[PDB]
């Protein structure tokens, strides 16, 4: 019976969260990379609420691109969102990285409720030429 597809502004959406519709719920942004991951919290109407990262948490070069720093930054941003008064959150992820999976669990343990996860990762259709393959 459960519909895995997300709701649409056109009716009908038979599921609210905290007595709220899907659209107005705040959105969390994760930008994952091999060297570091960056996390942010924003309102449904573009207003940023909280922002953190492994660098802001105080991790060095080798430690920025890890899962533990991701979990700590997630805990931090979730604490910020809860202090602001945000219970639910819509996840958005961008790119691969070590702490990609870790940020969500960090947020959950911090005390946020993830509703949906969207893979808003960039994809070029042969647009630009990346760097050449390095030889090690």
């Amino acid at each position: 019976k459960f519909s895995i597809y997300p709701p649409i502004p056109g009716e009908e959406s038979s599921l609210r969260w905290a007595g709220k519709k899907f659209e107005e719920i705040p959105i969390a942004h994760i930008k994952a990379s091999h060297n570091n991951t960056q996390i942010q919290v924003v309102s449904a109407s573009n207003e940023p609420l909280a922002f953190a990262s492994c660098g802001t948490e105080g991790f060095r070069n080798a430690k920025k691109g890890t899962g533990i720093a991701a979990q700590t930054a997630g805990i931090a941003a979730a604490a910020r969102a809860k202090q602001k008064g945000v219970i639910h959150i819509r996840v958005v992820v961008k790119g691969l990285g070590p702490g990609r999976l870790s940020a969500m669990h960090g947020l959950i343990m911090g005390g946020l409720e993830v509703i949906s996860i969207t893979d808003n990762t960039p994809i070029p259709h042969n647009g630009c030429r990346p760097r050449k393959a390095r030889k090690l």
Binding site: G67, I68, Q71, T72, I75, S102, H105, M109
Partner: protein
């Protein structure tokens, strides 16, 4: 269902250019590739996370760490017993997947031949 390979390779009777150029000659061997390990075991990440948390809060207070450290030891023991379980399971035989040894047995009992 399989993709056809009429004129993908460089043949005499194939006028157009070839598409495929495999390094080895495509002959179905009577031996199957044995399975492989996936990655290096890792566990207790959330346990050690909550442990470092309560540590930095309580200044290494064991009576307050009790629950974190108990959960960590229990998860470590679970990982160890799960390793032993999956080892005995792989030895006795993977359920749902077909074993390489008996695959080779079947293929040597009914082997294919490229020649006549």
């Amino acid at each position: 269902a399989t993709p056809s390979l009429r004129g993908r390779l460089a043949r005499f009777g194939n006028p157009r250019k070839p598409v495929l150029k495999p390094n080895k000659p495509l002959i179905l061997a009577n031996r199957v590739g044995e399975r492989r390990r996936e990655k290096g075991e890792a566990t207790c990440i959330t346990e050690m996370s909550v442990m470092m948390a309560c540590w930095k809060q309580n200044e290494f207070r064991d009576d307050a760490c009790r629950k974190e450290i108990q959960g960590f030891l229990d998860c470590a023991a679970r990982a160890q017993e799960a390793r032993k379980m999956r080892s005995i399971q792989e030895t006795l035989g993977e359920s749902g997947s077909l074993l390489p040894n008996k695959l080779n047995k079947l293929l040597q009992r009914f082997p294919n031949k490229p020649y006549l």
